[PDB]
Amino acid sequence: VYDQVEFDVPIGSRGDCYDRYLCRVEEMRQSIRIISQCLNKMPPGEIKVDDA
Amino acid sequence: GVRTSPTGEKVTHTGQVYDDEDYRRVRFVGRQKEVNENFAIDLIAEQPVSQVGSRVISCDGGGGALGHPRVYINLDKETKTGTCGYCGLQFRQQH
Amino acid sequence: LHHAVIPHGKGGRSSVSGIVATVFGATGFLGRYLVNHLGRMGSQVIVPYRCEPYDTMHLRPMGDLGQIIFMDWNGRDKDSIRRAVEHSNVVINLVGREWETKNFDFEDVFVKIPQAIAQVSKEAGVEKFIHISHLNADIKSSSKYLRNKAVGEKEVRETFPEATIIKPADIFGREDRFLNYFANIRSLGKKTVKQPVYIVDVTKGIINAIKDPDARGKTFAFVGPNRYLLFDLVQYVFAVAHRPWTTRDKVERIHTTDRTLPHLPGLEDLGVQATPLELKAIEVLRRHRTVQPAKTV
Amino acid sequence: PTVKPPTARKFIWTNHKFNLSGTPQQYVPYSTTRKKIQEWVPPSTPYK
Amino acid sequence: TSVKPIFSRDMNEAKRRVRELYRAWYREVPNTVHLFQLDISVKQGRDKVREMFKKNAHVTDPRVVDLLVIKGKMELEETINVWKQRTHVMRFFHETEAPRPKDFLSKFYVGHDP
Amino acid sequence: ASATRLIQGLRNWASGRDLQAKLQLRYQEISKRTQPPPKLPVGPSHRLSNNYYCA
Amino acid sequence: VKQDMPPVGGYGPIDYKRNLPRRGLSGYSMFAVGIGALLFGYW
Amino acid sequence: SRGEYVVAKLDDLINWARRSSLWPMTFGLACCAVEMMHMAAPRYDMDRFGVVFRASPRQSDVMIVAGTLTNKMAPALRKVYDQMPEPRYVVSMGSCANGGGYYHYSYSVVRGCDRIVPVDIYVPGCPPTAEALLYGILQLQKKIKREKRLRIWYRR
Amino acid sequence: REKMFEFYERVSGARMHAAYVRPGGVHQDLPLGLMDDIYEFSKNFSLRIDEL
Amino acid sequence: TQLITVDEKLDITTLTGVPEEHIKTRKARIFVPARNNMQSGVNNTKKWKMEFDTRERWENPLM
Amino acid sequence: TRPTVRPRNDVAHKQLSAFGEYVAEILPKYVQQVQVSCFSELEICIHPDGVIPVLTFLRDHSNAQFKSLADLTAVDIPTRQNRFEIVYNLLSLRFNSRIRVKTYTDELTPVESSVSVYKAANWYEREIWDMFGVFFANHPDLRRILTDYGFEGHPFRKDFPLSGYVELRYDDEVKRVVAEPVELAQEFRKFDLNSPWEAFPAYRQPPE
Amino acid sequence: TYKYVNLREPSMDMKSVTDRAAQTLLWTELIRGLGMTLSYLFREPATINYPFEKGPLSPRFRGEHALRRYPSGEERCIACKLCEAVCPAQAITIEAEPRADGSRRTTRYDIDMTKCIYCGFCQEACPVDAIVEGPNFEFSTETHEELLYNKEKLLNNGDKWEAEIAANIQADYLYR
Ligand SMILES: NC(=O)C1=CN([C@@H]2O[C@H](COP(=O)(O)OP(=O)(O)OC[C@H]3O[C@@H](n4cnc5c(N)ncnc54)[C@H](OP(=O)(O)O)[C@@H]3O)[C@@H](O)[C@H]2O)C=CC1
Ligand code: SF4
Ligand code: SF4
């Protein structure tokens, strides 16, 4: 269901350790954004495939 | 219903005991042999046989989903009771 | 013969060798090497320890799970010995002290304890009993160590008539008190003649005496392949170590020449090749570093 | 448990015990099965 | 029955490579003995090298001996640099294990292994 | 949440935020450790008719 | 049925943006404070 | 007598001093190291017990083997254990250090770290929780508390 | 990180190695009141990234 | 052409790393497995299985 | 077949089939089979001697641009004379696609190394050697990467047992970690779990 | 759908460059870090008082193994060997024979607690809820062989922890 949520992809500019540090921090912010969407859009139903 | 071997060792519910000439008893010297004093066969022997008024009976061990799978027991033989295969409970037809 | 004592496997760590051995004084040096050699065959070992259990921790990885049973014992309490030896088919005696303390003198260590162990093992139906004496043990000797050792050896022989008494000459190894004693003194030079014997051949001879049923009732004498003068031995030790706690009894012991006993059987009659001092002195005394070999007689 | 007591059973331990590691009351493993292969017992009388 | 060779077209180049590998190991052995502080002598190590070389000396396929020379070269580089410890060098000298029986009678006595 | 107002003001000044609105330590706002029993739903194949497995 | 579901009004808003407060005086005022302290000390 | 009481009190004093200032040397091998660092977290906080965080192996008392010991790794572990000052203790944490665990039948996994070093406390789990490892450390402290070194020295 | 370990153990039973996601769905459903605690955790988490 | 001719039989025993004890003293049985008589299915008898002889299994003294 | 059955991707299947025909038409010297699975995965099985050109084509053609090397694998199937199957997984970021290239070698035939095409393979195929004994010719630095230094034999071969032939333990006599033949306290219990009834009629092989 | 982290062009006017020069001459951000740490000093630490306080746990927790009983004394296990067939680490060894009354009961049930990965497949494959993973986790031993549980040890564990295991199963079984 990753195509039904909205989030951003942080893109670096210099390829150094600092840009990869900033990309990893920004991915934590975007993970909170997906979490808030998943809580409000959780559907009812079963948890396993019904093929027994 | 535990019993004590003549060497002083307790016999388990499976009947296991070490012989007098067995060296493996040296693993119990200075420590204790761990046995269970609640025998399942002795405890299920005290359960009274339930009297029912039907040809067949259904058993699930009580509690519904907390018991065993449900089974059906035939009680046509008047000589012996119908024992459940899982829980060991026995039933008897009153006619 | 019980079914659980039949040997099985390929002689590995988890196999069954069918040996139930109670090793007294297994926390020392010879006992450490003997337990190490016993545990690699999957033999059940019972270790009675007098000291703190922490000092026995190095004896733990020497065997598989449950193959070594540690238990408490006392040298003057026969009930502990009865608890220790009643389930074993071989008992090995390695109790000794280079010095006498306030609680235990030489007579208690070398006579009372071996006789008590031999009597308890005889009254418990133990098949094999091994007792480790000294080669130079003489009743009319000039040291209390050798006199009490000879008396204890005689008492063991009369108490246990089928006991194998083994007399090593002077054992050198990694944790010995023979080469390390000479290297750490940084006493004098006499006309003493000695045959040092490697620890591994002593352990192999003890294991072969366990295996061989002919060795019951014999009195072996384990000696090295070469005879050295004391001055040349000390010079070789100082040369291999690149070097330019004691008592009077040790000084009197190291001044006693190693007697020749051709009548007593040795390591060659147990299928063990004696290792010379030159091949193992470097691995013994590498830890003392910061070579022309000695001439023999 | 003062508000909601547990269900009473005849086999539940009435005396809880702490960890017994390092004590004489510790647990020692052993095989609970019996002997597998029975051995032949020779007769007690000579063939004479 | 035409196959792609690894390095040698025939047995002569393979034997040449075997000769170079043996020369390099024979030169290496004293440095291994001195550097690792082993308790063995140079004669024992060189005899061990000759023992492996004679043990693995019944092959006749150029690709197999080429791969064997390759693996021996890998072991030689693992010994040239200090990547092996004392234990890895002493793996070739099986000192701890008891010597296995060889004749029929001792194998009959110890167990069911043929 | 047991801190004095002076210590709260000092923390708010030195941190730069209002820390009392967002406290990391949990409190009575969390869910109860005991819950009412649930009734889980069934899947779409829990039917008595037109439910052949070959289709 | 009874299942673990979000409330009917939905959950509240959740902040996820970077929030640095942008506190403190400017460079001119900081330098002026420094020279004022220096002048008082010298006097 | 007087001497027995004196050596008993001295043994109690040195036991308290040794058990209240444990300095551990962890082995960051696998999952169980992550759970160890979760035990060092502010919630459980090993440091309030006197048990410092990431002590040097040259001054440490207890070694915590947290992870899977492979055949390529065991000589390094034995070297580290041999270069540690006495008195020293080894704590095996997790199923891998106890008996191999999931990888018991693997060709390159040492089936238990007790084959290399002597182990005092076995902590079971996969991973055992931070409370379980803290309980094992406290049990090691109890084991150190009932040591009788000076009593054995005086009695011998 | 410890508070999210409570989310793993409350839904699967283990703190770290859950073995929760299985081929065909998930092993067990979410317990009641779990998503309320996830909302409470993620509401304050944007402050924790800012402190780092 | 970059191709050479080798007419000797294939022999890779020196490269496999298996000790010689498990090379010269083992008997490899190549067979189609028999159908289990408690079932009528024949899907387990479609491929050839190669296995070895059975050596000694003994009892652990502990458990 | 709506709720519990995975939906099909027919447009991806058509595009992958067209590109497979395109590749098999451009390079008829080396490719031997082109197949598309039911879940839309393209496999191109080629001759080993063309392992260097074909990959280079997929690295450099403007219609392919498979610039990423996702994985490199060896599969051991003992029933074939060429028992080792070597698998390259390529990812094209420009067209957002994945491809699979498979070659075949036995124990003795060397392979041209693909380091000059993809640098990541410089470790990957090296691991293959350490697990399979597949020699890679013209490799910069080929040696073991995962096994022990004195390890004999290749473990991921299917004729290699689960537990090896040696195992380590500490010996106090030599003061060293030593290797001894393996003796397990518990034997690994082998389970025969295969049901004797045919499960998938679509994969039924013709008889003999 | 993407953002440009670290692509900011700083201002070149006199005010911003003087602010930057004052920042690198008077250590503004170092004072900010000091203030963060000082503010974090005056917060209440999250340290609990073990062993007098315990961490929160759910009734799904997988700890020490135990063998349950029916509420009549009869043991639940009927030697079906599903747990040893589903165990990924092969920690379970089962040997069975009919007992004197003819029931299908085990004679040996060993769990190697040093092999077990504590995954809970045995308690979810049991058709009678015989084997369970209890809530106990403070059961570390001092010897390796103490972690080799036989049938007697597991039965003792079940009789010891039944009063909690039954409540956990009652609270959890509706989700299964
Ligand atoms: N030079 C040599 O090594 C030779 C030695 N021998 C003999 O071989 C035997 C072993 O020698 P070695 O290893 O070098 O000596 P050790 O002193 O190292 O070993 C003696 C062992 O006996 C134990 N022990 C000593 N006194 C007592 C006591 N009163 N009560 C209980 N246990 C005691 C010690 O344990 P702990 O002190 O920890 O309690 C230790 O385990 C001795 O009998 C010695 O006479 C023979 C020939 C040569
Ligand atoms: S015991 Fe489990 S958690 Fe610990 S290292 Fe091994 S696999 Fe990881
Ligand atoms: S929890 Fe998993 S690994 Fe442990 S005994 Fe049960 S099935 Fe085996």
Ligand code: SF4
């Ligand atoms: S799954 Fe349950 S009933 Fe079956 S053998 Fe295991 S414990 Fe016994």
Ligand SMILES: [Zn+2]
């Ligand atoms: Zn029933």
